[model samples]
Target: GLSDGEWQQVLNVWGKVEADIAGHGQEVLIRLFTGHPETLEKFDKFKHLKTEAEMKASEDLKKTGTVVLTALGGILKKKGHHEAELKPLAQSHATKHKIPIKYLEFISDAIIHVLHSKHPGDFGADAQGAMTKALELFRNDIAAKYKELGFQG
Candidate 1:
């Protein structure tokens, strides 16, 4: 649901960071875990990591982060018209992974935090607003799939 200009703003900033998907994705995960340690319980690979150093050394974390960011990049490239792609992923998260929808919001927050910190100047009000709106749509779209799959809080 992003305006054309909003999509361009997001894509412009995305181009700045897309090259280091794993690095930025890992940073986002680190921020999320630091802020809400309990969320670590959801990831079997990360649950055992007790310290920041361990998290930094985690290969699984790197791999998972890459996957997360790659999917996000795909969505952004599609200009937010990715419901067909996102729905299946959401269904798996709901049924197979047993992930709660709330975690998506947490991850979205982490993503925003990382982006802002990395590109403080480029990620100004317009870019931030566009990114926020894009993520909001993502959350809502995924939530709809979770509901259809009978995944509850």
Candidate 2:
């Protein structure tokens, strides 16, 4: 891929692409993060875990959430749906409340804004408080809705 030292040429081509995107208030990712060498090193423990179908299924379900949400049709939808067995009835109630699944990420990111913008505390500690509030809301609103559908929410 590094034919005859064309580094500058490659950068130039993509530079225009970047400029064009920035002009439109958009961003073009310059790096393929999944291909990074450090990323491979980070997965060195991949072979250490016990091989269990349930464990693998759970991991697959988690990754599926990101894929489903990233796809064009999945925007702003409910997250953590790997617990689908319990979610069916909950989903029905959430829909009835007119709260899209995307609200989870939406509310969370907004909390991040408040946490990061506030005085003195680092992001992690601030996030802990934000998460607590989120849980409280979930207990009051989401859990109550699911309770109506039974199963202790």
Candidate 3:
């Protein structure tokens, strides 16, 4: 779904701040919740927290955010061909977690925003385009699996 140059562009953008998983993950989660506060309802552990800072302080939130960032890192580096990879996770999220698919897209787009802001030089138009394309493909893959499982999520 992406050219080699596009793949490299995403890789370069991610590589800039991938080392700071905690920081980057926090930014993504913060942007996601702040941009769409309704998303906070999905996290049972943080539902009562009622504030971005409170959610950030929860160890569960931090761990979950790190896992999300790591998974996206894998997809970007592997060129999104890891079909066998994300599909199961998607299905599990639909069945076990009952997360709406839109939240996945929401957080992904939020992640892109954070990347662009945190490293403006690394996320040029080309990199931003590449990241957007990669995430769309991943979202489509997840949606397909969710549908296959007879889930609207």
lDDT of model 1 at position 103: 86
Q: What Cα-based lDDT does every candidate model obtain?
A: 0.86, 0.34, 0.81
Q: In candidate 1, how many Å is residue 117 off?
A: 1.7
Q: Which stretches of candidate 3 lie over 4 Å from their true place?
A: none
Would you give me the overall lDDT of model 3? 0.81
lDDT tens digits, residue span 1-153, model 3: 888888888788778757888778877888888888888877777678777778767777677778888877887678978887787788678988888888988987897789878887856887789889888888888888888888863
Of 1 and 3, which scores higher on lDDT? 1
lDDT ranking from best candidate downward: 1, 3, 2
Give the Å shift of residue 88 in candidate 2: 7.5
Q: Candidate 1 — number of clashing residue pairs?
A: 0
Taking every candidate in turn, the Cα RMSD to the unseen true structure, in Å, is 1.2, 17.7, 1.7
Q: Give the residue spans of candidate 2 off by over 4 A.
A: 1-59, 67-89, 92-122
Cα error, residue 31 of model 2, in Å, equals 28
Kindly report which residue stretches of model 1 are placed more than 4 angstroms away from their true locations once superposed.
none
Worst 10 residues of 2 by lDDT: 24-33
